[PDB]
Design a protein around this nucleic acid. Sequence first.
RNA 1: AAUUUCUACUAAGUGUAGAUCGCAUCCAGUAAA
DNA 2: TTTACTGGATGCGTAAAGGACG
DNA 3: CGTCCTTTATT
Length: 1214
Amino acid sequence: MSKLEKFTNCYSLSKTLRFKAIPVGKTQENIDNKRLLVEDEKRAEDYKGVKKLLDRYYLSFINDVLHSIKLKNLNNYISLFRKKTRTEKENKELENLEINLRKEIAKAFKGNEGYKSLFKKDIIETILPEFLDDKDEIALVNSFNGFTTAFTGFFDNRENMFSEEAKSTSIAFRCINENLTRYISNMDIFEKVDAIFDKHEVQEIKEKILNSDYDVEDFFEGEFFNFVLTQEGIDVYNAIIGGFVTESGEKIKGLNEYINLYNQKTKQKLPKFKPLYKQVLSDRGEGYTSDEEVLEVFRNTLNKNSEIFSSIKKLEKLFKNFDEYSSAGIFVKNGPAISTISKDIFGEWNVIRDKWNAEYDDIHLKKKAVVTEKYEDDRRKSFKKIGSFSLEQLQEYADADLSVVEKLKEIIIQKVDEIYKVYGSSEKLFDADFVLEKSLKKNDAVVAIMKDLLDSVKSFENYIKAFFGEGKETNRDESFYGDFVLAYDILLKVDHIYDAIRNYVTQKPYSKDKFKLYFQNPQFMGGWDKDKETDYRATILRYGSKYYLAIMDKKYAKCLQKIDKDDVNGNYEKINYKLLPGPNKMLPKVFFSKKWMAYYNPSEDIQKIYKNGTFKKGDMFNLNDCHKLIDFFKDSISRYPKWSNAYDFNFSETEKYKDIAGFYREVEEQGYKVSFESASKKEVDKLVEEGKLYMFQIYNKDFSDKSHGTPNLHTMYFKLLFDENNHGQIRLSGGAELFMRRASLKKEELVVHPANSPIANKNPDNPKKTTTLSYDVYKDKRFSEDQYELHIPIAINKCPKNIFKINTEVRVLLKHDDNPYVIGIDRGERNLLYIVVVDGKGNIVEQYSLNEIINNFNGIRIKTDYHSLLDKKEKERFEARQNWTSIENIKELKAGYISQVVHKICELVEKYDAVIALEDLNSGFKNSRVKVEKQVYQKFEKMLIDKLNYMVDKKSNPCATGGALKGYQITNKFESFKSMSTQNGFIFYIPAWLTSKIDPSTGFVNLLKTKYTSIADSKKFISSFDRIMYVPEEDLFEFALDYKNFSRTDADYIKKWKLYSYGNRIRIFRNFDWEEVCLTSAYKELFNKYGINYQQGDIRALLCEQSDKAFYSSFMALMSLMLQMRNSITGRTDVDFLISPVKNSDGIFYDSRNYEAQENAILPKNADANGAYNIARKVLWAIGQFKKAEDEKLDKVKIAISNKEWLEYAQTSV
RNA sequence: AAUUUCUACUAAGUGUAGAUCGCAUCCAGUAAA
DNA sequence: TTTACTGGATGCGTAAAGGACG
DNA sequence: CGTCCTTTATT
Ligand SMILES: [Li+]
Ligand SMILES: [Li+]
């Protein structure tokens, strides 16, 4: 009935549910005494180490192959790639050449000796050990001798490199789809930029870069592409382009540099080269880790015995002996930091800059000018290229008897004596006996002591920095500077310790590092079938509503095998899980095996049928041969007790099958069963007691005795895994994983709200201002003791029955929906997101800013202003890094806001049966704080597309439409980013042009170019207006224009408009910088100022008779501001109004401000409400196109709306 | 201010609301020194 | 160059045949 | 030799 209601059971998707795993009984004590976790922790380190030994080998295997390959048909592939206009005759020949080009690379890899064993036991057991001749490395690899199955996943990732298919991970894809296309993109640039390369510059690269073995142009001929297959060959190629630095440190320039040097001197911009991407698997001061490290670093590098302290004591004597040195040879550097130096010596900041000019202007400002603005330019610029100031310059700035050299003596000594007074405050940090009472990151007292010391040492060091003077100065007193640079070069050492210590202290206090657990089983917990419990040694039990992960110790794999009790009232239940995974592989695997092919001797017609594939589609398809295959599989599935007894199959008549998939679907749909059997709880609780079984409660907060709310979505999915009403819509999958996450914090260090004291409640709208609990409330409690993590994959909609193209179906239903609502969703600098809901006639139903998320609980209203939370933490990091507190991450507060938004969007979708209109985002994000509005917006898009793959209403009965078992599927599988464009199910991606700056009542937009350009052009502007008069009845100036008399106005439909000088507008300065104009007085005052009388009717001739260009410049400034319909200010939160210069059919101008006040406005309330509304209306337009098309042509209807159709639409639907 | 985890919370108290696809790998990148 | 952090793209999400084995 | 690790099958 609703449009949504069609989109259930459309496609399969997979999700992972995460749970805490809580040990029960003596599990953890037995796990501890057997040192099982310690073994796994190390295995994790060895595993990452052994994979880097494998990649060392895989890289060597890749290289020798790719160094010894000559790809055939290179020239032909390039010739067809390099066609102006490509016809279908070689389009299909070229892509065959491109497919064949990759197969050539793949077939090289498989040909090599070792391709068989690269991803099998042998690579671990003998091949890799032979490759490494170090005995330590062979020891490390051989500790996986019983375990190579643990590498199965890693091996699959490495097979992806040797695929011939067109996927990012494939090596053949990196060479053919990526590196070759830029190699040829470079080819066509090089023969178009070749001229601009000097004789020697080409031979410069020849000798410095190319070995003198190859010519530069060789790398732009097709047949040398083979050189560039390897990383070594890519590193040479990219140097020809970007250059490289000699080890001496002087720079050799690449062709891209020569291009840019030429691009600057010739006024035009040449194209630049793309560099190649790296080849797959090429392997083309680090921070303190522990608290003790940081502390002994701090102690031994800043104490009075260290060299840094000697360097300060040495620099101190230098400044005390400042007058045994040449004042003409000591130089203080020139930066913006100088003004700090100026006030230290003279008592104010700009003595030094003021006295530089008084002497500078003295002969170099001419007497004429005295103070022309000419001089500001270059007296401000001649100041900043002066590189230093001698102490003899500074003293000429001084009057008797201020001696600059004794002031600097006193400033540094007052500065060295402060470092020494902070060392007293900190001396207890330097003791040998000193023991840290608390961890450093939570110890705010001890870090405050370091920062005071590292700050005072830094104040002094950055002060001393000024006295270097960047010289490279003609007569430095190298008596002074000799010792100075020594002391300063050591004093510079604090800049690494300062940053290294600060980075440790501001790391997040907790960690999420965790390692995989195997319980001494290389295929641990791989599946759930009853047959393999003993092989995988893991299974699921339950005691009523509570579920357990039960793990068999390696010594007792059968310890759960024969247990039963007759009543469950005192007992567990063990899962009975049976899965036949993937008939397409499993049925041939079994029935053609060496074990059974004899048993059901397949007709030689079947074996011939199966080898040649007459049962699959294409050239060799034969319908009766597929039915004859199914009957063999059908008959063999019976007489296979393991399948026939577990699943009672009920297939369709074989004649009714159209393709083999029709059969496999029925096998896959029915080849899954879950049930529970009884298990004596006494005879299992003792297995745990004895250490022969380990049991963990599968747990999140929803399983607590004190839990009463609506459950987490994922607890619902988990629970439904075993509900009788789950008829296959959610399957429990194999491939679970158990992890151990060591604690990262201690309870005694955690931030606490202690029991019985009142805690403030943070929502001011609730008159219960306080909460007082009888137990402690800890921050990050979950990270303060060890935690087991269980990750359980589930399969949703594994057998979809409602198969159709989602986009097509959405269009069909939209064509035949009498009243389809649309949700327009706008991105605003002003508002993170704005939302307008319209019905099928464009009537505004809802409009509001999603800046504040408003939530419902038990009569409580809470509004959470996510907008000001977001900016608070955005600058907090930049500002509060100085505070030296822990790193704030803003990515999780945006994700938090996004999840609040996504819930709100789906509630609107369901309430109004509504499609979504989204705004295309500008690729370039302009200053400043650009991901603040595009980060929330791009993340909102990914997150929303996700939820709409399986959209569940936790309140529905699970089996109701929209329930957890019958979730809505209104976006296509999020396989890629761009495979969808313009529409994805209920989501339409529509461009933003003229959605904001348009009159919603009329569709009027500004197509006029009103920047003042010349004196002459302003009178062609005024004469292209049909009339310009004063309407005394309205105190308005009317401008009758026909857009056809102005350039670039094709898109407009109405053409003829009458503009008025109605209302106020807002102006901005170019050098409060904004001021606010009222139009009718500016036109009146300007006409009075220049002797024009407005009341003299058609005044176009009158305006052009003016001779002063100031009138034209200030008149077009008004014809720019009258046309500016959107008014708001850089940073201005306050005013966002939209006002129009045009009247509507009923003779009324439009203010958003007329609508911002009322509760239920039929028009937008501000420029952001307007933008959302028009993004919605543009989708309405597309629905209109659907309604004019015929169902069979809906798929080809273009919904990307042009500026011409938009304006026609917006101007005619009123 | 608690969590499988994230965000915002704390109405009679070990929690509430919404969100949450994991693991492994490859590859593009942006910020800092 | 190095460190960190974030963006998309690939694979797996398996029972059973096959084999070694001390 | 029955236990345990490895390798297989591909809509
Ligand atoms: Li809840
Ligand atoms: Li708090």
